[PDB]
UniProtKB/Swiss-Prot annotation, chain A:
GO terms for molecular function: antigen binding; IgA binding; immunoglobulin receptor binding; protein homodimerization activity; protein-macromolecule adaptor activity. Glycans are attached at residue 46. The lineage of its organism: Eukaryota, Metazoa, Chordata, Craniata, Vertebrata. Its main location: secreted. One of its GO terms (cellular component) is extracellular exosome. Serves to link two monomer units of either IgM or IgA. In the case of IgM, the J chain-joined dimer is a nucleating unit for the IgM pentamer, and in the case of IgA it induces dimers and/or larger polymers. It also helps to bind these immunoglobulins to secretory component. Part of the secretory IgA (sIgA) complex that consists of two, four or five IgA monomers, and two additional non-Ig polypeptides, namely the JCHAIN and the secretory component (the proteolytic product of PIGR). Part of the secretory IgM (sIgM) complex that consists of five IgM monomers, and two additional non-Ig polypeptides, namely the JCHAIN and the secretory component (the proteolytic product of PIGR). JCHAIN-containing IgM interacts (via CH4 domain) with FCRM (via Ig-like domain). The keyword Transport does not apply. It comes from Homo sapiens (Human). Keywords: Disulfide bond, Glycoprotein, Pyrrolidone carboxylic acid, Secreted, Signal. This is Immunoglobulin J chain. Disulfide bonds join 10-70, 78-103.
From Swiss-Prot, chain B:
It is found in: Secreted. Disulfide bonds join 22-92, 38-46, 127-187, 219-287, 233-241, 333-403, 347-357, 437-483, 451-458. Residues 1-102, 120-199, 212-314, 326-420, 424-498 form the Ig-like V-type domain. Residues 1-498 are extracellular. Either free or part of the secretory IgA (sIgA) complex that consists of two, four or five IgA monomers, and two additional non-Ig polypeptides, namely the JCHAIN and the secretory component (the proteolytic product of PIGR). Free secretory component interacts with bacterial antigens toxA of C.difficile and eaeA of E.coli. Changing residue 99 to N: Disrupts the interaction with pentameric IgM. The chain holds residues 19 to 559 of 764 of the full protein. Glycans are attached at residues 65, 72, 161, 383, 431, 454. The gene is PIGR. This is Secretory component.
From Swiss-Prot, chain D:
Constant region of immunoglobulin heavy chains. Immunoglobulins, also known as antibodies, are membrane-bound or secreted glycoproteins produced by B lymphocytes. In the recognition phase of humoral immunity, the membrane-bound immunoglobulins serve as receptors which, upon binding of a specific antigen, trigger the clonal expansion and differentiation of B lymphocytes into immunoglobulins-secreting plasma cells. Secreted immunoglobulins mediate the effector phase of humoral immunity, which results in the elimination of bound antigens. It is linked to Agammaglobulinemia 1, autosomal recessive: A primary immunodeficiency characterized by profoundly low or absent serum antibodies and low or absent circulating B cells due to an early block of B-cell development. Affected individuals develop severe infections in the first years of life. The chain holds residues 400 to 455 of 474 of the full protein. It comes from Homo sapiens (Human). N-glycosylated; important for IgM secretion and its localization at the plasma membrane. The interaction with FCMR is glycan-independent. The basic structural unit of both sIgM and mIgM molecules consists of two identical heavy chains and two identical light chains; disulfide-linked. N-terminal variable regions of the heavy and light chains form the antigen binding sites, whereas the C-terminal constant regions of the heavy chains interact with immune receptors to mediate effector functions. It comes from the Eukaryota. This is Immunoglobulin heavy constant mu.
Length: 106, 498, 232, 54, 55
């Protein structure tokens, strides 16, 4: 019944809207603004560099996500970083997988 | 909405086994992410009974396995040794238990002569008797209200609830069983016997299709119902079926251009194509065979169940191509990028009760004779599309035009030609050594070129360019030939000459 | 006068592209005439080796018999055998090595546990335990890093894969790192990287510091703004 | 328009046409569905182990 | 799915620790927990550790 205005998935906001066809009086129908933020609370600031500080401020300007610094990983998009792991002589900098089950190559 | 889709209602007797498939949009996350089957209890949450990573709970140990077919795009849960604690409310899903991405199966276990028929068929109620009554008033009565009501007597009475549709062998054959008549009868000659008749409602045959894709309902019925007027209703929110096709004529104001009722076989196994499925097609469909093409009782129906997922990988081609009369259209039909090496085709539209789609062109070469000179199937751009250019338009060649392919999984894209009134965007002589072609200034970036049309398409023919000419003008210094434009890799306005 | 045989780990195949395989002879008497020949299942010979090492200060000889194969040979479960021909042992022994076919791949779930708050009271040490649950086959390769730099191998002890209790054919492992309690109550993100043949890019990694993992203080500060807006 | 249209909407595009534009079209539209809400509801949930945004 | 609680018996000497697990007073099966053999601790001198998980 409702229409998704915003389905932003790197802050995880999800503003929708819906006209409530009321008790059958005149046009005293209401319109909604069902915001649904989901706050990470253990993701870092730089989402891809996991050696960063945690987070305190979560700022949601809901114009600037109706038209960046993402707070959550997106599920389908896959994230990486590069670490210096060694094994013997060399420091072979190979490419990890921050979120797995999404970085599986075809 | 969450795009998993399973069976909404499952019924199976204790001791027997269950196979529950649940489908997912075959992404590369959804192929590899964790797939669960949790028991939504009361007071809270899922308790994962059998995950797909390899957990199998204390309860379901030894009796369940969850497998995963990622190319088929589904995962299947086999559960043997049911009991009546296996009844209740379950979810099949992906990822974490809390975050949705799931579907809600309702498992419902049941406790264990006799007959078990599907709707509208025959059945032969058989009853033994003794030799001392071999001429007596044999009969069949129905047990409703703690008293046998009369159904079949010997002398020629049949009930108003059971009029005419039943004859008498001893035994007795009833025909056109409807679900209200699924009764537990009794037969009498002084001996008796009971008689039990369950009539099942034909189960869903889950069809998880795609947004802007297409679906093929394979309606297979029997030699009793070959010449009966087959249909496809769509059982909506009450009890009524707002019919969608017929064989005696009808179709819908909705499904214009899209339903293709294929011809009958010798087995009566006609098939139905719907294309361009939108989000409001996502429910139970029902092919059937009654006379007057509406859903009535006595009709051997055979349902389905669609689901049109919204997480498509199908690209969004424009549905309405607007061409001016005697102008040009140039449409792109998308096709599966894996299935690049296959034989393209094209089509017209001719109604649903006809349900026709005859072949205009292909990629091997054969064009219809009444379209020669004005029609060319292309291949550029590749890597996903194939283009068809049609010019020299007409008021009556507007319609619905289907982009077939000889591939395995098919998106029969339908594109709609709107022949408006108009003027040609390109000026060419009437019917004609140098031939000119006069291009507007909007095509400034576009590359101006002539073709030699055949069944093989366009081969290049040189020319020399001028300066400002009342825009652009090109020459044909030197069957049917055109002077179209080209924008990088796509194609635009072409006009034909003799 | 014993013998050890060292097949290649996956994190020596993947990480150096050098699927060489050895067998070391130790416990033996400090003699000579060493011939450590690597032979296939069909008896045939492979390439030779070098760098046959010294005896010990502790007077027990140590030698290393190397060969290099290809990857596709190793994955097909061929039988390889090093034969030791010493003057002490009158039978030139075979040590047999094969990558055993028919095992599934499963993905390790790496959870990284922070040090107990019963331990950060003594002000002496803190122990962070990477826990690589539920994988298959053996040979995970845990290593740690502190602040983008790889820690020294004197500090962590990775366990060996012992099979998991409830799960039938899936292993697990551990690794503990002892960081001093002053170095944890500063911050100091630690990362646990694991490498395994069923992980996506072959490698994954987790992290913890004082403030993320099991904290005694959750300090959210969210602000919404322009909540009316003009949203289409 | 009819007032009776404003239970059903029909979304009413108004397209302008000026010379300082790419298309020379800056079409806009407002229906009853647009415009002010007079009932919000923020519903923000918080969770230690989130961070995937399904 | 399943929780792995871990008992980290650190810092001792000599070997032969013996870890077992109880729920509410009566001891659990040994099919459910997995004690490692003691391994020597590298930062400290010749003092072992062990660990034991229960799932
Ligand atoms: C921290 O965030 C920065 C930007 O805020 C990230 O940026 C660069 O990211 C690309 C993509 O992987 C790398 O190729 C660049 O090398 C990064 N720049 C630098 C200077 O490192 C960055 O990924 C994050 N930090 C780290 C260490 O990954
Ligand atoms: C708790 O929250 C308030 C409000 O933002 C903040 O001022 C205060 O410092 C916080 N305290 C802690 C211990 O995080
Ligand atoms: C909690 O967060 C607020 C805002 O960042 C900060 O000012 C405050 O000092 C924090 N509390 C502590 C104990 O750090
Ligand atoms: C937001 O308000 C609507 C209408 O008042 C209500 O139906 C909905 O449940 C509210 N949102 C949440 C998350 O409860």
């Amino acid at each position: 019944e409702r229409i998704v205005l915003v389905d932003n998935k790197c802050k995880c906001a999800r503003i929708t809207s819906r006209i409530i066809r009321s008790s059958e009086d005149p046009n005293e129908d209401i319109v909604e603004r069902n915001i649904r933020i989901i706050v990470p609370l253990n993701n870092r600031e730089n989402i891809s560099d996991p050696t960063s500080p945690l987070r305190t401020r979560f700022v949601y300007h809901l114009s600037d996500l109706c038209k960046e610094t993402c707070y959550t990983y997106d599920r389908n998009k896959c994230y990486t970083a590069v670490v210096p792991l060694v094994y013997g002589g060399e420091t072979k900098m190979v490419e990890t997988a921050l979120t797995p089950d999404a970085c599986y190559p075809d | 909405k969450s795009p998993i889709f399973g069976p909404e209602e499952v019924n199976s007797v204790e001791g027997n086994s269950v196979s529950i498939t649940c489908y997912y949009p075959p992404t590369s996350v959804n192929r590899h992410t964790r797939k669960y089957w949790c028991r939504q209890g009361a007071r809270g949450g899922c308790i994962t009974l059998i995950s797909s990573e390899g957990y199998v709970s204390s309860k379901y140990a030894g009796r369940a396995n969850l497998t995963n077919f990622p190319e088929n795009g589904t995962f299947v849960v086999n559960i043997a040794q049911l009991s009546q604690d296996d009844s209740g409310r379950y979810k099949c899903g992906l990822g974490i238990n809390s975050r949705g991405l799931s579907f809600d199966v309702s498992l419902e276990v049941s406790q264990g002569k006799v007959y078990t028929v599907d709707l509208g068929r025959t059945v032969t109620i058989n009853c033994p008797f003794k030799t001392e009554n071999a001429q007596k008033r044999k009969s069949l009565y129905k047990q409703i209200g703690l008293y046998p009501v009369l159904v079949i007597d010997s002398s020629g009475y049949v009930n108003p609830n059971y009029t005419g549709r039943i004859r008498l062998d001893f035994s007795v054959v009833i025909n056109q069983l409807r679900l209200s008549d699924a009764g537990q009868y009794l037969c009498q000659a002084s001996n008796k016997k009971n008689a039990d008749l369950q009539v099942l409602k034909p189960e869903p045959e889950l069809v998880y299709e795609d947004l802007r894709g297409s679906v093929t309902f394979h309606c297979a019925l029997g030699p009793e119902v070959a010449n009966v007027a087959k249909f496809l209703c769509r059982q909506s929110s009450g009890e009524n079926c707002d019919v969608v096709v017929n064989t005696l004529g009808k179709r819908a104001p909705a499904f214009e251009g899209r339903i293709l009722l294929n011809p009958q076989d010798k087995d009566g196994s006609f098939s139905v194509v719907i294309t361009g499925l939108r989000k409001e097609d996502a429910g139970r469909y029902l092919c059937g065979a009654h006379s007057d093409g509406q859903l009535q009782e006595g009709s051997p129906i055979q349902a389905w169940q669609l689901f049109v997922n919204e997480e498509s990988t199908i690209p969004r081609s424009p549905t309405v191509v607007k061409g001016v009369a005697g102008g040009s259209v140039a449409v792109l039909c998308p096709y599966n990028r894996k299935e690049s090496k296959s034989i393209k085709y094209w089509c017209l539209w001719e109604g649903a009760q006809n349900g026709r789609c005859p072949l205009l062109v292909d990629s091997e070469g054969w064009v219809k004779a009444q379209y020669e000179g004005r029609l060319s199937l292309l291949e550029e751009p590749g890597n996903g599309t194939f283009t068809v250019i049609l010019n020299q338009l007409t008021s009556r060649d507007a319609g619905f035009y289907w982009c077939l392919t000889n591939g395995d999984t098919l998106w029969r894209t339908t594109v709609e030609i709107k022949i408006i009134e108009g003027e040609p965007n390109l000026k060419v002589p009437g019917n004609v050594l140098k031939v000119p072609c006069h291009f507007p200034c909007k095509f400034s970036s576009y590359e101006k070129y002539w073709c030699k049309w055949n069944n093989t398409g366009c081969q290049a023919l040189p020319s020399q360019d001028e300066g400002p000419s009342k825009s652009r003008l090109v020459s044909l210094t030197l069957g049917w030939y055109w002077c179209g434009v080209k924008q990088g890799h796509f194609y635009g306005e072409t006009a034909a000459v003799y | 006068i014993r013998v050890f045989a060292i097949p290649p780990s996956f994190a020596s195949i993947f990480l150096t592209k050098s699927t060489k395989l050895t067998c070391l002879v130790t416990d033996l008497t400090t003699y000579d005439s060493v011939t450590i020949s690597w032979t296939r299942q069909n008896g045939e010979a492979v390439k030779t080796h070098t760098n046959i090492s010294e005896s010990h200060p502790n007077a027990t000889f140590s030698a290393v018999g190397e060969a290099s194969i290809c990857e596709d040979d190793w994955n097909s479960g061929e039988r390889f055998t090093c034969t030791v021909t010493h003057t002490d042992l009158p039978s030139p022994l075979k040590q047999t090595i094969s990558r055993p076919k028919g095992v599934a791949l499963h993905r390790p779930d790496v959870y990284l546990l922070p040090p107990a708050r019963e331990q950060l009271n003594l002000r002496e040490s803190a122990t962070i335990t990477c826990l690589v649950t539920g994988f298959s086959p053996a040979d995970v390769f845990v290593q740690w890093m502190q602040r983008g730099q790889p820690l020294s191998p004197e500090k962590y002890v990775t366990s060996a894969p012992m099979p998991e209790p409830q799960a039938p054919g899936r292993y697990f492992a551990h690794s503990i790192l002892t960081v001093s309690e002053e170095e944890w109550n500063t911050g100091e993100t630690y990362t646990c990287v694991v490498a395994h043949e069923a992980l996506p890019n072959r490698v994954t990694e987790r992290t913890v510091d004082k403030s993320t993992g099991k904290p005694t203080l959750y300090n959210v500060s969210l602000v919404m703004s322009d909540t009316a807006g003009t949203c289409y």
